Amino acid sequence: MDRRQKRLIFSTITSKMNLSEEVDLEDYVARPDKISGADINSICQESGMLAVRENRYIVLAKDFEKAYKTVIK
């Protein structure tokens, strides 16, 4: 979808997620992948869920790149 919309969706949802002060969602927002808002709530829910397999209570950059590459394809 629209880059601007995409960014709005990422920021609105991660807004009540606790992310490390260095994560930057633009790295994903700027990717040339057409994805839905479902896909984004998805990467976002997966990221917080994986806050737990290495098990850190704050969401990190790595939680995202994972969620993202799994969810999109």
Added chain:
Amino acid sequence: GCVSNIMICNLAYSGKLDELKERILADKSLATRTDQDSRTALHWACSAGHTEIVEFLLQLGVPVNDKDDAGWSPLHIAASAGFDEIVKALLVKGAHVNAVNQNGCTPLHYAASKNRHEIAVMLLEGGANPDAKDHYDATAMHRAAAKGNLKMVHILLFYKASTNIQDTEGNTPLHLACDEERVEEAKFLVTQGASIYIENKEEKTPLQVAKGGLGLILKRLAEGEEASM
């Protein structure tokens, strides 16, 4: 808290400086062990903004340029997070301004994206390349223009960043500013040399991308510049 499998990194992230000092001075090798993500106490203190723990680790002389397993250097982490004082202590100790991580980003990509002006300047003054391209051939200016960070676009142009680099979708920063309706950014860019002619991969120039009010304004500006200058 508890972000790492190594307890000294959790102390660094937690801000427990006194405990961290006692353990490391008992066995200095501990200050540079890497954890499961290849981070050390320095990465985690930067990630949490504990300037004082960063100063203690730099006082001990630990490496300031090692990357974690996603290719993030302590300078990347501090620059994206917005630690001005940490960024500054890192640079004084030799942090590599053009280091790249696994997305191909330099710390300036993150400073620009997140509107960290003072850090972008420290970086550019320290020699960062304004034109570094990430893995999608996007520069700091693509980030800043897309997001509407006008003053960040002013700072980049001041350090001579190019305005016509194309990402892998063939977009220049001007296409991105047009696409997201960043009116003042788009105008500033055309006034500084962005071309209203370059086509992206979908065969569109920034004008074909822009809403009509903006496209007319950019057109006008472009003919202004092509007439004088």
